Write a protein that binds this ligand. Structure first.
Ligand SMILES: CCN1C(=O)C(/C=N/c2ccnc(N(C)C3CCN(C)CC3)c2)=[SH]C/1=C(/C#N)C(=O)NCC(F)(F)F
Lengths: 290, 134
């Protein structure tokens, strides 16, 4: 199976990108630090072998990620710089997020203080509101694709499971892969829409404040039964306003969850301290006035 | 490693005597957790000076980089632990080590307002125009 070219050549512009360090992988993709050989500008290069794109659902994922992401520009969405291909690889040029993702933050800190959860969650919800108003459902929101830049600003990425809503009240009936936080309506026959993104934000909120996932056990079957039955417990130390907002988002009936705008306007976002800046120490140890 | 996991826990928690025991019993001082933190990173960021010295004498890798590209010196500089900054430099810590943002311990100390650390790092040859290249 083909080695990745050491230098990525865009056949349109003929810009050369030198391949640097491995950053990450998942599904059919590896991501690498790449730099313009002329400007010295540094990007994340997503690299996908066409050997892993022979099936319909895989070619669908690559094409849909590119067509959705290339149309997006927002403070809380990964920068999209371009895409090109040779005979063996598809190459996607993205904003390098030098402070990893909320997964790395989660593994080091476990439960955040509430003000830090409030800081990160507002940026997630603003990015997702911009997606929902452009008729984009992400469908795979997870700590690992909530990236951080040098200013610890959240950037939503990995639009591989994303879809575009084509008409009003449409219920999508298919997914080209399995979401991280499976909404109960995805487990059912009834189809799904924007509200899967609000479910996933509810799971992320629980995880940031509690330090573990709300439904995940060792057995995928037990987990799915817990989702279908809406069985989870919020520990008693979570503040009431936060607990109430987790309960609005983690409801079986999707029409009963708040819309992304109703979520943005929840009392949680105004009930306590809103940090301006988090210190860089917040990646490893708890802050005091935050 | 079971002793590796125990040594990481002891160093984080500042349990000096539990650290000396684990080392004597064959603990990897270069044990790494699920985001690249070593015992030295965890002692350095938590302000546990005695454990930093114990680890360095028992061969702890002074420039071990975590999943952010932080060395124990980066973590000591951003948390304002002057004695740990000095001990780490004396054990040959790269004063101009770069994290994955191209930041030196000096950039991080300046950003957090640890100006005593900024002064110490300049004394041990920190370069204000330190630049990472490809
Ligand atoms: C949003 C763009 N993006 C990034 O900016 C990423 C940045 N990862 C970083 C940043 C800084 N350092 C590292 N290291 C591994 C360093 C290596 C040296 N070491 C000492 C320290 C760690 C990794 S990963 C990424 C992805 C996207 N899209 C992506 O991983 N996507 C999922 C995929 F791959 F599955 F398709």
């Amino acid at each position: 199976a083909k080695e990745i070219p050491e230098v990525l050549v865009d056949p349109r512009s003929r810009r050369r990108y030198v391949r640097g360090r491995f950053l990450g992988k998942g599904g059919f993709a590896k991501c690498f630090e790449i730099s313009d050989a002329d400007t010295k500008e540094v990007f994340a290069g997503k690299i996908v072998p066409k050997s892993l794109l022979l099936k319909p659902h895989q070619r669908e994922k690559m094409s849909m990620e590119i067509s959705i992401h290339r149309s997006l520009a927002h403070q809380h969405v990964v920068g999209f710089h371009g895409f090109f291909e040779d005979n063996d690889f598809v190459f996607v040029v993205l904003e390098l997020c030098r402070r990893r993702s909320l997964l790395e933050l989660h593994k080091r800190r476990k439960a955040l203080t509430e003000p830090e959860a409030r800081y990160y969650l507002r940026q997630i919800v603003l990015g997702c509101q911009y997606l929902h108003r452009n008729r984009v459902i992400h469908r795979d929101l997870k700590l690992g694709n909530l990236f951080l830049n040098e200013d610890l600003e959240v950037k939503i990425g990995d639009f591989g499971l994303a879809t575009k809503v084509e008409y009003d009240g449409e219920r999508k009936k298919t997914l080209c892969g399995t979401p991280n936080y499976i909404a109960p309506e995805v487990l059912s026959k009834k189809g799904h829409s924007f509200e899967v993104d609000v479910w996933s934000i509810g799971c992320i909120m629980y995880t940031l404040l509690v330090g573990k996932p709300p439904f995940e056990t060792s057995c995928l079957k037990e987990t799915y039964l817990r989702i279908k039955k809406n069985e989870y417990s919020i520990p008693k130390h979570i503040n009431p306003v936060a607990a109430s907002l987790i309960q609005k988002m983690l409801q079986t009936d999707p029409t009963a969850r708040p819309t992304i705008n109703e979520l943005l306007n929840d009392e949680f976002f105004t009930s306590g301290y809103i940090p301006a800046r988090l210190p860089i120490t917040c990646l490893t140890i708890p802050p005091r006035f935050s | 490693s079971d002793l590796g996991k125990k040594l990481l826990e002891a160093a984080r928690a500042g349990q000096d005597d539990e650290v000396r025991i684990l080392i004597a019993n064959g603990a990897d001082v270069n044990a790494v957790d699920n985001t690249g933190l070593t015992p030295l990173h965890l002692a350095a960021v938590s302000g546990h000076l005695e454990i930093v010295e114990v680890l360095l004498k028992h061969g702890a890798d002074v420039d071990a980089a975590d999943v952010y590209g932080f060395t124990p010196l980066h973590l000591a500089a951003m948390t304002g632990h002057l004695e740990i900054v000095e001990v780490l430099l004396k054990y040959g810590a790269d004063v101009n080590a770069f994290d994955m943002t191209g930041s030196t311990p000096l950039h991080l100390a300046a950003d957090e307002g640890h100006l005593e650390i900024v002064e110490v790092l300049l004394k041990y040859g920190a370069d204000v125009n330190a630049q990472d290249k490809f």
